[PDB]
Design a protein around this nucleic acid. Structure first.
Lengths: 1048, 126
RNA sequence: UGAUUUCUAUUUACGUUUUAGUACUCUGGAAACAGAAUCUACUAAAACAAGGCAAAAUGCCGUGUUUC
């Protein structure tokens, strides 16, 4: 459109990106909208990777079997006339250790050994235990194989217990190799074999790929050699692209985190409040290198101060001070304390890398020795058996050391060092980028949710820049929840605490008799936390006086909001009105160090400390607020407070900010970017009197955007906010004005400038992300067999498992309601009568089979005259009638029953206009097949489905609709969900500005929250519309014919 | 049953009346099978209007966490998104009266109009 | 009101299904045996997203991202 001078506010959520465009000088709302998308989930790619690995495992098993087959055909032990059907492999395998085998049974034995060949290394199996680990089972079996071969033990298991297969069939490759080579040394005297034959077969039997070899030639997941393996496993640094990322637990990474911890400490003492170079070195050498997990006590003893004088440390949830521990340093020190080893930082880095990227004790030993270092062989032996080394660092070791210098020689932490250095991502040349690149987000070590939302926000920014020109200011806020589960967690906790506060208010009203407590919840809660004490005078605050004359007491802000910018409970105390009046724009340390106070500062400090110790009535934030002894007139302290309460310093936010600011820096574009703390925006949204409930659609996401945009406006209008404005923008700040009182603060921030105008905005736009991706899940996992009943229908057969589980009442329900659905009901009535007897005997039990097993020790056995019937473990029964399905019966030749899979997943639907009536044909995921560069709709299946819908050859192709495409039915615009019932020509749609569920809820409508529509003779008009990423509508123009070739 | 046997594929949907749930089954892996049913008013191609009770079964709805009162909402959400992306039509049986079809779904099918209702009534939760 | 884990490798024993054999059930028979049923179980051999490559090979791909 027409270029504008504007502020751009961005609200980045887990499923939405709201944008707000406000005029920079007139504060008028230029535009607003939301980009909507589905929440990413790591489980999608997780299942993809797991199924790819399983397919690889099955393929390699089959290939090993076929290679053994080829070897057998080579030595003429297998011909095209060999028959091995009746051969029992266990009997043949044990017989071949003592006698000649038939060529047929010899081949069968070798093949059966090749199919199941045991474990090489337990580290290769990522397992969930049948409840006894594979390592333990191998221990048991090898102890049981002290005088036997695997085949002999398996054969006696078969002859005694009747089973060989299951949990206890886990051996290791060594035992199989022993049995196989003894079998071969026996059979070579009767069959014309080679030593090459024996070597080739044993190799085929025991060989498999390593973690560092990877897939074979031609794989997009593979690598050429070990160097490419390492480089693909690690990745490249964002700022130094030819450097590889460090491992997570390298020594220098732990030292970097430890120096970050030390630079964050604020020590109350006569000397420098910050630890100095010599002091940090002394603490690292004498505490961090002597104690595995350093404590605040040890650090305080090192610098000869007390624990209460040290502030600004990380904390556990038990409230204990937390400090970085040098993992590899103490891991190697416990094996060798030699100065030549543990005091060699690069050597410890190499040891950590080798422990991380190598997954075998033997490979670890070899790669440690290959380091021509001063480590002894026994030291390497001991080191090879270490555990806990996983993960890759964000930075390369080069950047780690570059920042280690700044950590040693300054008191800045990692965030401040990165803000001052302003490193530029160099993996993509931001110099030659015509817009903000989205590929840098793929590098970040981030949750896929935040990754997707960051990419979406970058593209929204690009589109807004293309539409309205370069913005003046960009202000961004990222959602606090990491996913939907975290959102539900926070909702539950907030409902819980609201319930508890309501209970306390209600029983206060019951005990005291006055409803005044209903409007004093904040003062009452502060009274509770302080145990009825005014924390500035330590006098008693009678609950009756507070409830009767609440203005005798005031909520004072501990650190003045003109510097702290903190509006939360952590910066509030219920004090006497006179104390708050006399305190002014000061801190408790300044007010109680003064003539105006009534008590000392040390009395107050002692009280605050003992009050914080007990029952968590003080938060750590509140305690470090009350005992803030620094001069808040110092610019460093003000910068710290702005960075804490006004800026979002989470790693993901910092990475996105760095990317944006770098792109603008490199291209010499003057766009000031800041990321606001969400607590401040919550405060602003509340004081501006926005409703607590968000029940009118996606527009809220855009609303928030405008809100923070409005906030940005404030920070540009007043010079007394300049410092904050320049800290949020990460700009170096140069008789400056300043907010001097809290009333001035409230005048600046609470005043509802243009808030009604924001609430009156009605031209919101919405963009829903369309999904056209082919080759998604094509069919369900479950493999079903079917029967044909008397009436000619096809029923699906379900299995019932866990028959003897304490809580499984499904078989009891089935027997009591519909016994005829069981297959044994019709085909084995005597076993069913046994089962019904057992069910009625313990009918008052939830699972009668469970109690039967516990009382008798017997399972349900198949009916027998001689009581030799087999144990019944699962029961087949009739399910539903077979509707649309995928027939896979051809994979099972001569199968008497049809083998099916269910729920053909749809891809799209194509709408045609046929002699005045609207029809549509459903394109399924199974109908799209990849051909060598591009996905193609199979024309045979497509014409089949067209004919099934009676679509003419002269029918006019109207459009094709994927998920979230905009459809216009009878003049009403919806978004497409998908095909609901292909046979009934029923599609599913939803509203654009709000979900149909909440639309019905607002009107208290109980209708089904799904919009299902029929497309038939009654349909008058069908159109297709689409939007850009900003939600700007346009009708889809063309395509006389449907798309058959897809890019992918 | 008081059903009527018809030709069923040329039937136009007039008004979606109700959506009930009959069974929420745990497959004892991270997945669930949700059986539900729809009550619609429908007009046959011949002109007569019936009330359609259409049964659907959404299988392999992945949910790994143990479901509570604080959790069943997310299971319902995942069931909905799995059902929207797949094929779950089983069959449809028709009635002449809305009261008769409602009685069918009420007693012979044991259907609740709330996912939470069905979860507690079948024992998935409290 | 009250702070990064993405991407990716290797493998074992299971699990579902079909076929064959055996066991279990039923019928006939003196027996040798043969049928009926395909329910329950063991063993082996196969298939396990539809499928596509590739040709003796520790062979490769197929449910992710992005969808303007």
């Amino acid at each position: 459109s027409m270029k504008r001078n504007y502020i751009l506010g961005l609200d980045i959520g887990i499923t939405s990106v709201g944008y707000g465009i406000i005029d920079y000088e007139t504060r008028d709302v230029i535009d607003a909208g939301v980009r909507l998308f589905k929440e990413a989930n790591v489980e999608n790619n997780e299942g993809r990777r797991s199924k790819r690995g399983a397919r690889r495992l099955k393929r390699r098993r089959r290939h090993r079997i076929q290679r053994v087959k080829k070897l057998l055909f080579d030595y003429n032990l297998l011909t095209d006339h060999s028959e091995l059907s009746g051969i029992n492999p266990y009997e043949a395998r044990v017989k071949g250790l003592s006698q000649k085998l038939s060529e047929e049974e010899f081949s069968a034995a070798l093949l059966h050994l090749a199919k199941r060949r045991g474990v090489h290394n337990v580290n290769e199996v990522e397992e969930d235990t049948n409840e006894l680990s594979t390592k333990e089972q191998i221990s048991r079996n090898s102890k049981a194989l002290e005088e036997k071969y695997v085949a002999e033990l398996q054969l006696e298991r078969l002859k005694k217990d009747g089973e060989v297969r299951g949990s206890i069939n886990r051996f290791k490759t060594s035992d199989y190799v022993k049995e196989a080579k003894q079998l071969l040394k026996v059979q070579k005297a009767y069959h014309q074999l080679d030593q090459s034959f024996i070597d080739t077969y044993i190799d085929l039997l025991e060989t498999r790929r390593t973690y560092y070899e990877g897939p074979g030639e031609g794989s997009p997941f593979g690598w050429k050699d070990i160097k490419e393996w390492y480089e693909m496993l690690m990745g490249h640094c964002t700022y130094f692209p030819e450097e590889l990322r460090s491992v997570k637990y390298a020594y220098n990474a732990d030292l970097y985190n430890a120096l970050n911890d030390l630079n964050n400490l604020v020590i109350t003492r006569d000397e420098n409040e910050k630890l100095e170079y010599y002091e940090k070195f002394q603490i690292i050498e004498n505490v961090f290198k002597q104690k595995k997990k350093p404590t605040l006590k040890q650090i305080a003893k090192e610098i000869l101060v007390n624990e209460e004088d040290i502030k600004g440390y990380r904390v556990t949830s038990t409230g204990k001070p937390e400090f970085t521990n040098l993992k590899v340093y103490h891991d190697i020190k416990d094996i060798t304390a030699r100065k030549e080893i543990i005091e060699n930082a690069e050597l410890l880095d190499q040891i950590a890398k080798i422990l991380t990227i190598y997954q075998s004790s033997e490979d670890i030993q070899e790669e440690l020795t290959n380091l021509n270092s001063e480590l002894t062989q026994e030291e390497i032996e001991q080191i090879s058996n270490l555990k806990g080394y996983t993960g890759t660092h964000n930075l390369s070791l080069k950047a780690i050391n570059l920042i280690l210098d700044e950590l040693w020689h300054t008191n800045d932490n990692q965030i401040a060092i990165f803000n001052r250095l302003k490193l530029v991502p160099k993996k993509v040349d931001l110099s030659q980028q015509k817009e903000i690149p989205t590929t840098l987000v793929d590098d970040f070590i981030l949750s896929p949710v935040v990754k997707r939302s960051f990419i979406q926000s970058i593209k929204v920014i690009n589109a807004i820049i293309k539409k309205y020109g370069l913005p003046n200011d960009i202000i961004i806020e990222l959602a606090r929840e990491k996913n939907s589960k975290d959102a539900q967690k926070m909702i539950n906790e907030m409902q819980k605490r609201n319930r508890q506060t309501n209970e306390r208010i209600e029983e206060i009203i019951r005990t005291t008799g006055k409803e005044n407590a209903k409007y004093l919840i904040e003062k009452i809660k502060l009274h509770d936390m302080q145990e009825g004490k005014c924390l500035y005078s330590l006098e008693a605050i009678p609950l009756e006086d507070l409830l009767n004359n609440p203005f005798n007491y005031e909520v004072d802000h501990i650190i003045p909001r003109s510097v702290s910018f903190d509006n939360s409970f952590n910066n509030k105390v219920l004090v006497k009105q006179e104390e708050n009046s006399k305190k002014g724009n000061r801190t408790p340390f300044q007010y109680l160090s003064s003539s105006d106070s009534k008590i000392s500062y040390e009395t107050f400090k002692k009280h605050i400390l003992n009050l914080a110790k007990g029952k968590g009535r003080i938060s750590k934030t509140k305690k470090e607020y009350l005992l803030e002894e620094r001069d808040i007139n110092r610019f460093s302290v003000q910068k710290d407070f702005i960075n804490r309460n006004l800026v979002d310093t989470r790693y993901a936010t910092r990475g996105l900010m760095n990317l944006l600011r770098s792109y603008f820096r490199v291209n010499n574009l003057d766009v000031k970017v800041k990321s606001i703390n969400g607590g401040f925006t919550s405060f602003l949204r509340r004081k501006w009197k926005f409703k607590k409930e968000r029940n009118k659609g996606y527009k809220h996401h855009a609303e928030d955007a405008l809100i923070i945009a409005n906030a940005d406006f404030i920070f540009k209008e007043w010079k007394k906010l300049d410092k904050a404005k320049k800290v949020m923008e990460n700009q170096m700040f140069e008789s400056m004005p300043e907010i001097e009182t809290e009333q001035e603060y409230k005048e600046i921030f609470i005043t509802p400038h243009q808030i009604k105008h924001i609430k009156d905005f009605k031209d919101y736009k919405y963009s829903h992300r369309v999904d056209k991706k082919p080759n998604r899940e094509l069919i369900n996992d479950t493999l079903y067999s079917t029967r044909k009943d008397d009436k000619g229908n096809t029923l699906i057969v379900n299995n019932l498992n866990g028959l003897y589980d304490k809580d499984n009442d499904k078989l009891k329900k089935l027997i009591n309601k519909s016994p005829e659905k069981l297959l044994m009901y019709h085909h084995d009535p005597q076993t069913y009568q046994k089962l019904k007897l057992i069910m009625e005997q313990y009918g008052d039990e939830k699972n009668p089979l469970y109690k039967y097993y516990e009382e008798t020790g017997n399972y349900l056995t198949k009916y027998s005259k001689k009581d030799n019937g087999p144990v019944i473990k699962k029961i087949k029964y009739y399910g539903n009638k077979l509707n649309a399905h995928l027939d896979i019966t051809d994979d099972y030749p001569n199968s008497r029953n049809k083998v099916v899979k269910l729920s053909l997943k749809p891809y799209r639907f194509d709408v045609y206009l046929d002699n005045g009536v609207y029809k549509f044909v459903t394109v399924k995921n199974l109908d799209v097949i990849k051909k060598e560069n591009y996905y193609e709709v199979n024309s045979k299946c497509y014409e089949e489905a067209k004919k099934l819908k009676k679509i003419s050859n002269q029918a006019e192709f109207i459009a094709s609709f994927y998920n979230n495409d905009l459809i216009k039915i009878n003049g009403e615009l919806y978004r497409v969900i998908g095909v609901n019932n292909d046979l009934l020509n029923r599609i599913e749609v939803n509203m654009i500005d709000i979900t149909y569920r909440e639309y019905l809820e607002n009107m208290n409508d109980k209708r089904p929250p799904r919009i299902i529509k029929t497309i038939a003779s009654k349909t008058q008009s069908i159109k297709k519309y689409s939007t850009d990423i900003l939600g700007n509508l346009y009708e889809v123009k063309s395509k006389k014919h449907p798309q058959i070739i897809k890019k992918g | 049953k008081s059903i009527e046997i018809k030709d069923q594929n040329n039937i136009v949907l007039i008004d979606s009346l109700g959506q009930f749930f009959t069974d929420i089954e745990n497959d004892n892996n991270g997945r669930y099978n949700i059986d539900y049913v729809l009550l619609n008013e429908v007009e046959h191609d011949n002109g007569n209007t019936y009330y359609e009770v259409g049964m659907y079964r959404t299988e392999e709805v992945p949910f790994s966490d143990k479901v509570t009162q604080d959790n069943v909402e997310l299971l319902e959400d995942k069931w909905l998104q799995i059902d929207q992306q797949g094929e779950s039509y089983v069959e449809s049986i028709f009635f002449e009266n809305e009261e008769d079809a409602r009685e069918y779904i009420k007693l012979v099918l044991k259907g609740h109009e709330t996912f939470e209702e069905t979860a507690k009534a079948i024992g998935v939760i409290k």
